[PDB]
Amino acid sequence: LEVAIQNAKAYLLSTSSKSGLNLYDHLSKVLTKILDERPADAVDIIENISQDVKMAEYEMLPAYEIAETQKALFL
Amino acid sequence: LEVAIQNAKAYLLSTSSKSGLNLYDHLSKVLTKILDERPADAVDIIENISQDVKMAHNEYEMLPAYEIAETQKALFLSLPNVMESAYYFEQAGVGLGTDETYRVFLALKQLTDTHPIQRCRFWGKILGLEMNYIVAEVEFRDGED
Amino acid sequence: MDTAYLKNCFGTGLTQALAEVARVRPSDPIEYLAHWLYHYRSITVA
Amino acid sequence: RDIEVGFLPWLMNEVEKSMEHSMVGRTVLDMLIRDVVERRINDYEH
Amino acid sequence: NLIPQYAIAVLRSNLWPGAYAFSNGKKFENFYIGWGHKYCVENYTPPSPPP
Amino acid sequence: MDADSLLLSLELASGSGQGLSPDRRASLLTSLMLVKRDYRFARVLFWGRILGLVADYYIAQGLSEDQLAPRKTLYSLNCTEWSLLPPATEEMAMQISVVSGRFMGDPSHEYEHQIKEETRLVSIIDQIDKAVAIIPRGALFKTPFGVTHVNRTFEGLPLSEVRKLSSYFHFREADFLDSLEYDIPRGSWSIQMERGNALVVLRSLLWPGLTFYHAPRTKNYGYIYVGTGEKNMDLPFML
Amino acid sequence: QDPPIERDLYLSLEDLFFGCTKKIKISRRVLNEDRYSSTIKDKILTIDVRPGWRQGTRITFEKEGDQGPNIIPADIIFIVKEKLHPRFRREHDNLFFVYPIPLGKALTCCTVEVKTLDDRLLNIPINDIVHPKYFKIVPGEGMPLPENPSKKGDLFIFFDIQFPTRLTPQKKQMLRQALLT
Amino acid sequence: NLFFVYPIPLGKALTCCTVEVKTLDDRLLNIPINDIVHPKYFKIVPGEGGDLFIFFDIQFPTRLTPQKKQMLRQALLT
Amino acid sequence: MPLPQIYVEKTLALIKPDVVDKEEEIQDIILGSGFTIIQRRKLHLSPEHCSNFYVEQYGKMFFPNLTAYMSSGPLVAMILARHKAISYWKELMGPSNSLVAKETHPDSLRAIYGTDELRNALHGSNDFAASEREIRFMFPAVIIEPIPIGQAAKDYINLYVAPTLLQGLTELCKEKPPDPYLWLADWLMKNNPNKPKLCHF
Secondary structure (DSSP) of G97-135: EEEEEEHHHHTSS--EEEE-TTS-EEEE---S---TT--
Name the minimum distance, in Å, from the CA of G106 to any CA of chain H.
Answer: 10
Could you give the residue ranges of the DSSP H alpha helices within chain I? 23-33, 47-53, 64-70, 85-93, 98-104, 109-113, 128-138, 151-160, 162-173, 180-190
Helix, strand or coil, per DSSP, at residue F222:
strand
Cβ neighbours of B15 in A, within 8 Å: 40
By C-alpha distance, which of G79, G99, G72 is closest to G156? G99
Q: Which of A1, A4, A28 sits opposite D32 (nearest CB)?
A: A28
Name the minimum distance, in Å, from the CA of G21 to any CA of chain I.
Answer: 6
Cβ neighbours of A1 in D, within 8 Å: 24
CA F140 – CA G104 distance, rounded (Å) = 48
Mutate which of C21, C37, C40, C45 to disrupt the I interface (most I C-beta within 10 Å)?
A: C37
- CB distance H63–F106 less than 8 Å? no
DSSP element (H, E) containing B86: helix B82-90
Chains D and A touch (3+ CB pairs under 8 A): yes
- CB distance A60–F198 less than 8 Å? no
- CB distance E3–B76 less than 8 Å? no
Give the angle subtended at the CA of A20 by the CAs of A14 and A22, to the nearest 5°. Answer: 30
Residues 6+ apart with CB under 8 A from I93: I108, I109, I110, I122, I124
Interface of chain C toward chain I, CB-CB under 8 angstroms: 2, 5-6, 9-10, 18, 21-34, 37-38, 40-41
By C-alpha distance, which of A6, A55, A5, A9 is closest to A30? A55
Buried b (16+ CB within 10 A) or exposed e, I59-77: eeeeeeebbebbeeebbbb
CA G34 – CA G57 distance, rounded (Å) = 36
By C-alpha distance, which of I98, B83, H4, C16 is closest to F23? B83
* E45 close to F235: Cβ distance less than 8 angstroms: no
Query: Which subunits count as partners of chain D given 3+ CB pairs below 8 Å?
Result: A, B, C, I
Is position I105 annotated as part of the catalytic site?
no
Say how many C-beta atoms besides its own lie within 10 A of residue B23's C-beta.
22
Mutate which of F228, F233, F235 to disrupt the E interface (most E C-beta within 10 Å)?
A: F228
- CB distance E2–F228 less than 8 Å? no
Query: Which subunits count as partners of chain E given 3+ CB pairs below 8 Å?
Result: B, F
Residues 6+ apart with CB under 8 A from F98: F113, F115
Beta strands in chain G (DSSP E): 5-11, 58-61, 75-82, 88-91, 94-102, 112-115, 121-124, 138-139, 154-162
Query: Which subunits count as partners of chain F given 3+ CB pairs below 8 Å?
Result: A, B, E, G, H
DSSP state string for F116-154:
EHHHHHHHHHHHHHHHS--EETTSEEE-TTS-EEE-TT-
By C-alpha distance, which of I81, F149, F12 is closest to B54? F149
Cis status, amide bond into I175, omega within 30 of 0: yes
Which residues precede a break in chain A, with C-to-N distance above 2.5 Å?
56
* F58 close to F77: Cβ distance less than 8 angstroms: yes
Beta strands in B14-143 (DSSP E): 117-126, 133-140
Q: Which of F54, F106, F110 sits opposite H63 (nearest CB)?
A: F110
Helix, strand or coil, per DSSP, at residue G52:
coil
Q: Which of A22, A23, A42 sits opposite B23 (nearest CB)?
A: A42
By C-alpha distance, which of F75, F59, F118, F120 is closest to F94? F120
Question: What values do phi and psi take at D7, rounded to 5?
Answer: -65, -30
Name the minimum distance, in Å, from the CA of G16 to any CA of chain B.
Answer: 12
- CB distance D38–B1 less than 8 Å? yes
Q: Which of G108, G131, G165 sits opposite H36 (nearest CB)?
A: G165
Question: What values do phi and psi take at G159, rounded to 5?
Answer: -125, 135
- CB distance B99–F29 less than 8 Å? yes
D38 contacts chain B (CB < 8 A): yes
* G17 close to G120: Cβ distance less than 8 angstroms: no
- Identity (one letter) of the amino acid at H72? L
Residues 133-162 of chain I with CB under 8 A from chain D are 147, 149-150, 153-154, 157-158, 162
Helix, strand or coil, per DSSP, at residue E6:
helix
Query: Which subunits count as partners of chain A given 3+ CB pairs below 8 Å?
Result: B, D, F, I
Q: Which of G118, G123, G137 sits opposite F82 (nearest CB)?
A: G123
- CB distance H11–G176 less than 8 Å? yes
Name the minimum distance, in Å, from the CA of I163 to any CA of chain C.
Answer: 11
- CB distance B10–I38 less than 8 Å? yes
B1 contacts chain D (CB < 8 A): yes
I201 contacts chain G (CB < 8 A): yes
CA H53 – CA H55 distance, rounded (Å) = 7
CA I125 – CA G109 distance, rounded (Å) = 57
CA H16 – CA H3 distance, rounded (Å) = 23
CA H7 – CA F11 distance, rounded (Å) = 55
Name the minimum distance, in Å, from the CA of F139 to any CA of chain E.
Answer: 30
- CB distance A2–I4 less than 8 Å? yes
* F170 close to A37: Cβ distance less than 8 angstroms: no
CA B65 – CA F33 distance, rounded (Å) = 8
Chains E and H touch (3+ CB pairs under 8 A): no
- CB distance B57–I43 less than 8 Å? yes
CA G162 – CA F120 distance, rounded (Å) = 31
Experimental determination technique: cryo-EM
I146 contacts chain C (CB < 8 A): no
C46 contacts chain D (CB < 8 A): no
Q: Which of A1, A12, A35 sits opposite D40 (nearest CB)?
A: A35
* I121 close to I16: Cβ distance less than 8 angstroms: yes
Cα-based distances in Å from G115 to B28, E14, F39, I5: 45, 40, 10, 53
G58 contacts chain I (CB < 8 A): yes
- Identity (one letter) of the amino acid at G105? K
Residue among I49, I83, I123, I200 flagged as catalytic: I123
Cα-based distances in Å from F195 to A63, A69, F13, F144, I78: 7, 11, 10, 40, 50
Cβ neighbours of B81 in E, within 8 Å: 6
By C-alpha distance, which of I77, I50, I84 is closest to I135? I77
CA F41 – CA D37 distance, rounded (Å) = 40
I157 contacts chain C (CB < 8 A): yes
CA G112 – CA G128 distance, rounded (Å) = 13
Helix, strand or coil, per DSSP, at residue B6:
helix
B60 contacts chain E (CB < 8 A): no
D36 contacts chain I (CB < 8 A): no
Cβ neighbours of A2 in I, within 8 Å: 4
Q: Which of B23, B27, B38 sits opposite A11 (nearest CB)?
A: B38
Give the angle subtended at the CA of F220 by the CAs of F122 and F154, to the nearest 5°. Answer: 105
Pairing of β G75-82 and β G5-11? parallel
Tell me the angle at which helices B2-12 and B23-36 cross, rounded to the nearest 10 degrees: 90
Helix, strand or coil, per DSSP, at residue C45:
helix
CA F107 – CA G108 distance, rounded (Å) = 10
Q: Which of F141, F152, F197 sits opposite A63 (nearest CB)?
A: F197
- Identity (one letter) of the amino acid at I143? I
- F203 DSSP β-pair partners: F190, F211
* G7 close to G45: Cβ distance less than 8 angstroms: no
Residue F175: DSSP 8-state: -
- CB distance C6–D7 less than 8 Å? yes
Cβ neighbours of B55 in C, within 8 Å: 43
Q: Which residue of C has its CA nearest to D7?
A: C3
* D40 close to A32: Cβ distance less than 8 angstroms: yes
